[PDB]
Every structure is written in C-alpha cells, then in structure tokens.
Ligand binder design. Structure first.
Ligand SMILES: O=P(O)(O)C(Nc1ccc(Cl)cn1)P(=O)(O)O
Ligand SMILES: O=P(O)(O)C(Nc1ccc(Cl)cn1)P(=O)(O)O
Ligand SMILES: [Mg+2]
Lengths: 398, 398
C-alpha cells in the first residue's frame, strides 16, 4: 500500500481523493491530512481514515479539532501552521503527496514535497502559474515525480509517451516524437453569443457552466477562457513545451479532455466523464490503474463531438495569458492575481463581464517588475498586482 | 538503423512503407523485397532502395526481373517461390518484417518471421483470423514482437499501456487496468438504409465506402460489417481479450480509429487522417516516432463525431463473426473462406447482398473438421470451406 499526506483534504479534490482510497483501502493508507478551518469535516476524515497526523492552518482550529478527536476517542496527533503542513508533505514514510492547497498557502508545502522527492499529485495546478521555473528546477534536481491532477493536464499526461511520463518537465518533446500538446476547453457559456452582448452578460449567466457545474469564480474563468490561459501557462512548464508545441482548441462537449499530436500524424486523446475521481485515481495508481467509482463513458449517449479555434476577440484573456508567458513569471503571477481581483469584482457586480479582460491587461501594463527568484518574491508581485487591480476596479466604479 | 524485409512490397501497404523509408533514409534500410508478378514496380523499388534480395511468385517473373535489373546495373539477387519468401522473413540480419502478403499465401512467410523471433509489422489479417491461436502461441515461444499495422488494431495498441505493448497476447488486460477494447467502424454505406432494401442493393452501391476509397471486396466487407467481425476475431487473439472485454462501436466519420477503456473511467483513443502511412510509420519506429509524410489532422475541418451501437439485424455478419470465434479457428477460418466466395459471387451479381451473410452462416453449419494444429490444417479447412461455399452459390443461382 502507498502512504500519502493530503494537502487540503477537506476541499472538493481532497474529498474525491479520499473517496478513491475508500474504494481501495488495501492500496492506499492515509498518513496525514492537512486542511484550513473546516474542523467538522476534518473530524470525520480522521475518524474514517485513521491518519497519524491531522493539521489545521490555525491554532484555534487545531485545539478545537483536538478536543473533538479525543472526545471521540481518536489518537490522531493534531498540529497547525504552515511549517507543520510542510513536514507532513516531507514525511519520510509517505510515498505520494496530493497537493490540493490552492493559492499562495499551497506554495511552500508543495515545494517541500518536491525537495523531499515525493511523488506529487499536483492539484494545486496554479502553483506552476507563479513558480513554474522554481518548481520544475526543484523537480529535476530531486527526481520527484510530478503527476498532474487537473483534467486537462492529466489527459495530456496519459496521452504522452512513457519516457516523458517519467521525467516529466525535464524531458524533450520533439525527441520523443511529440509535435504539440492540444489543450481543450468548452469555450464557456458565451461561446455563440454576439460579441456586442458580452458587456451586458450577468454573473448568473456567466456562471452557467456549459456541462457540469462548478464554483462561481472558476465558472467565469471558463467563460473568459482565462482558465485555458492559466492551463496553457502551466502546460508549457509542466511538459517543457514551446509556443509552437501548444495548441488551444474549443470542444463544447468536453468529452475529450485534451490530446497530444505525434510526428507520424497520430493524435492520442483521453476521454471520460466530468468526474475528478478519474484523473485523481489515475495519478494515485500510476503506472497502474484502480477503480475510481466513476461510471464507464457511454458512447451511445453523447452529443456529436465538435471542435473550433478560439477567437481572440471573444477570448482576449486567452491571448493575454499566452503573451504573459512570453513576458515571464512576473507577468503570469500578476495576471493570475489581477484576474482574481477582477473576477470577484464582476461577481460582486462592480464591473462588467468585458472589464475583466480590459482590467487584467491594464494591470499587466502597469506592473513591470523584477522576475521573482523565490516564493517570497512571487508573493510580493502577487500582492502588488492585487492592489493595482483593486485600485482600477475602484477608479472604474467611481 | 533498422534492417527490414517487406513481404508484398508492390501492394498498397508496401509502397506506403517504402515512402516512410524514403522519408527516413538514416533509420531504415531495405534488405529484401518480396512480391507476386508486378515486375515493373519491383524494378523501380529495387532501383530506388538497392535491396540485397528480391523474390517474385514464380520463375517467369523472376527471370524477367533478374534480366531487367542486370540491364540497369542493379546488383540485387533475384529469387522466386514461397520458400524463398519465407527465407527472406527469417534473414538473420533482419530486425523487422512488414508482413503485407494477404490471404492464405503470406501465412507461412509471416509465421517464418515469428518463428525467427523478429519484429513483425502485421499487415495481414489472415494470420489472426485463421491461425489466431497458432500464431499467438508461436510469438509466445519465440518472443517475436507483433506490431499491428491495420488502422483499428494499431489504434488500440497505441492506446494500451506499455506493459501490454511489449507482451502482446501474453499480457493480462485486467491486471493492467484495462476494462475493454473499443473497436470502431464506419457502419458502411448502408448504415441508415431500410432493412428490407438491403436485399436489393447492387455491387456499386455496396462499394461506396463512406469516407475514403478501397478495394471492392473490402468495401463490401465494410458494408456488411464483416470487416469489423474479422477484426473482432483478431483483436481477441492479439490482445488476449474475452467477449466482455470487447466492444464494437459505429463511428461514421472514422476520425477515431479505435479506443480502450480503463478501470478508472479513462478512455484513451487514437485519431488521425485516413492515411495508412501513419500506423505503418508508428510500427516501424516503435517505441519511438518518425515523420510519415502524413499531414496533421485539422480539428477545425471535421464533421461532428458520432457513435452508435451496431444492430445485428442490420449486420448479421458481425454477430456471425463473434459466434465463430467461440467455436474456434476452424469456424473462423471457415467463415473467412466462405465470405471470400460469397462476396465475390455478389460482386459478380450471382447472389443478393443479403445472401452473403445467409450463405456464410450456412457453410459454417456444414463444416465438420475442427481446431487445426498447423498452417497446413488451416489451409485444408480454408479449401473445404470454399468448396462448400461455391456449391451453395451455384445451387442458389438456379
Ligand atoms: O479549468 P477547470 O477549473 O474548468 C477544470 N477543467 C475540467 C474539468 C472537468 C472536465 Cl470533464 C474537463 N475540464 P480543471 O480540472 O482544470 O480544474
Ligand atoms: O477494415 P479495413 O480493411 O476497412 C481498414 N480500416 C480502416 C482504414 C483506414 C481508416 Cl482511416 C480507418 N479504418 P484496415 O486498416 O483495418 O485494413
Ligand atoms: Mg482493421
């Protein structure tokens, strides 16, 4: 059995991950769980998976969790703080780490697992957006095995050749016969909407994700294709791909999750249901497979599969992301930060749907900062981008 | 780099493989070309690739080739006969042999390559349709590597995990996380045709293969779906799959060439242009890749992709193939042979389109002899099934 520590175990990814171990108790053993302040869910997971440690990101939560565990008779050792999270990610005993702590808080714990040479199940896919160079370098200098969890990068991973799967990031694409990586996205709810109407779209309309449902923030990123922009940035880093080795394709049905084009003309693709348990189960079991609880894709109950090229006038964020990648990590993390501010603003009805792209671009222009050399530097750029975005949102709605 | 013998060089497959060689002079060198009576093509191929040997069906063709090669300075030595063909597939300094001689012929030549433990680029269905067990047991003894060239089987191979690829037939699908093999076909020209009208379809209507063009016989097999039936028989032998590990889907557009379903819900697929140089190049270069001259497929210029379950009322030949497999190599060899007779009879306007499946079944019901122990035994069953089929055709033509 493989032992693991789950960074951000109470979130959607963590729960799905735990569902997978529940489907394969013999194969997986939970050594440590780390979360934020959701004490109630953490108690249940502790009582259900018997981890050696449980870490909350706060003293009040740790004590409150420690009280309920003992009241229930559990002997799980409780801890709190970022440093503890990092220790769990580096436990001598654990084989793989599910990195699901989103945002800046997930940076160091994920980095800690990389240096420890663990097998990383990268769910915190946004960390490559800010620390792409830092992370891939650390990955190569420790031989840690990266296994992308997000649906798109996972599909690509599965469609990639073995020599690349192992040595992910520091492997040569052209040398393994790979022509390009085909990143796919639904195009959002405003795929066929008249451009002239994009400015009047409402938060409710923007949050109607085409197929499956998800958070409001990630729904809007899907409508602006900023999510495809961030994933593009991540892919480049994760698969050592150039601009000419990347292709973005709209696929409304989202049956195909992404593909890889090969030298001889072949295109390999991964398909399935929109259940995160599939990519998650894939990474956990790699190089083998395990039951994930996800039902088999029924090809007789599918909508006709179509494709199309992304129109940049309709998705400026997508072009904006590609441009930032060429600009550097300072640009990508600023774009990410700004977008986080403008999307929240749009959702709070402070700005129009179309202002998201305009304001994201405006923040990038004003930035012009020194490429971060460490996480703390990444943090500063981020902090500076959010305030610039906040000011623009304010001077916009004023 | 790779030394190779091409069995059936003057055919479609053969010319395509030479084109791939022309695209990669540094990685492939032709040692021997084998063909039937097309000396004109053989001369051009011999002149362009300077093989060591070249063999034709008989002495007359050989004599003419030898003299024409001498006249133009070629030093290639000319041979003739089946034994000479079998010897070329077993040349000690040969790494791969493209097995493209079809029908009962080619059986011994491909088995000769398997018997010499070489890498076989299998472009001959007869082998697995008639000698499925014999050949798979044979590659198991010699440890020869089978690399499937036909579009569907190649696609499956590409979508199978590495451990299975390096141990065909010998590997266990379940232990490697594979739930099933998804074999796809166009459904032919009569996919939406009213069932009662199939009895009146003409040779010309049947020979209108949906997407690209091909021989009349192969076109008829796609119309009756006997082609998928035979491929169903091969797939089970080649990948060691049981009835429940096989699925046959109709995909009209033929962009997806086949797929494989995994235990976690993932479905891997191979897509591309309808150009045989892709799978041929794939096999020649395995485990690596090489350019094939084939253009990358344009996802923005495709028809919506669809799937549907094949109805046995519409495709009795398919079900008949599945039943034949259960009965053994005698049944499949018998089915294959009867079908060649009934299709030719239909093309000659001797029987109705619907008479193909009807007579195929009838001959199977009259075949006694079972499970052959060697190629000679299969040949004998083949010969007997053809006679029974000819009689039933003649009896029907009155
Ligand atoms: O980019 P998203 O957050 O929308 C999500 N993408 C997905 C999700 C499900 C399916 Cl079926 C296809 N793509 P991601 O996995 O990247 O977080
Ligand atoms: O079964 P067929 O002989 O018709 C042929 N099948 C193909 C051919 C090309 C494409 Cl694009 C898809 N399927 P096979 O490769 O099996 O001989
Ligand atoms: Mg085939």
């Amino acid at each position: 059995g493989k032992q693991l520590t789950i960074l951000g175990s109470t979130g959607s990814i963590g729960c799905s991950t735990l569902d997978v171990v529940r489907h394969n108790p013999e194969h997986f053993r939970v050594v440590a769980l780390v979360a934020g302040k959701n004490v109630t869910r953490m108690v249940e997971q502790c009582l259900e998976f018997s981890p050696r440690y449980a870490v909350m990101d706060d003293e009040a939560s740790a004590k409150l969790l420690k009280t309920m565990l003992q009241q229930q008779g559990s002997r799980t050792e409780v801890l709190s703080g970022q440093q503890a999270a990092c220790d769990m990610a580096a436990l001598e005993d654990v084989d793989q780490v599910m990195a699901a702590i989103v945002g800046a808080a997930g940076l160091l714990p994920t980095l800690a697992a990389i240096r420890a040479g663990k097998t990383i199940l990268l769910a915190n896919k946004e960390s490559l957006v800010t620390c792409g160079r830092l992370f891939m370098d650390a990955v190569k200098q420790s031989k840690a095995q990266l296994l992308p969890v997000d649906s798109e990068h996972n599909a690509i991973f599965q469609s990639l050749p073995q020599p690349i799967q192992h040595n992910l990031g520091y492997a040569d694409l052209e040398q393994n016969g790979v022509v390009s990586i085909l990143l796919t996205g639904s195009g959002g709810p405003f795929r066929e909407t008249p451009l002239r109407d994009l400015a009047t779209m409402t938060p409710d309309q923007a949050c109607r994700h085409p197929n499956w449902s998800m958070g409001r923030k990630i729904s809007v990123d899907s409508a602006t294709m900023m999510n495809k922009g961030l994933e593009y940035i991540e892919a480049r880093w994760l698969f050592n791909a150039s601009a000419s080795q990347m292709e973005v394709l709209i696929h409304p049905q989202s049956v195909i999750h992404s593909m890889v084009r090969y030298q001889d003309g072949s295109v390999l693709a991964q398909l399935g249901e929109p259940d995160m348990r599939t990519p998650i189960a894939h990474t956990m079991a790699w190089p083998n497979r395990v039951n994930s609880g996800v039902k088999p894709l029924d090809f007789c109950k599918l909508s006709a599969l179509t494709f199309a090229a992304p129109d940049y006038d309709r998705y400026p964020c997508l072009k904006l992301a590609m441009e930032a990648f060429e600009q550097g990590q300072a640009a990508t993390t600023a774009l990410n930060a700004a977008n986080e501010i403008t999307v929240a603003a749009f959702l709070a009805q402070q700005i129009r749907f179309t202002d998201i792209a305009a304001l994201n671009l405006s923040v990038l222009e004003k930035m012009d900062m020194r490429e971060p050399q460490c996480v703390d530097d990444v943090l500063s750029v981020d902090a500076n981008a959010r305030e610039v975005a906040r000011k623009e949102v304010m001077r916009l709605a004023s």
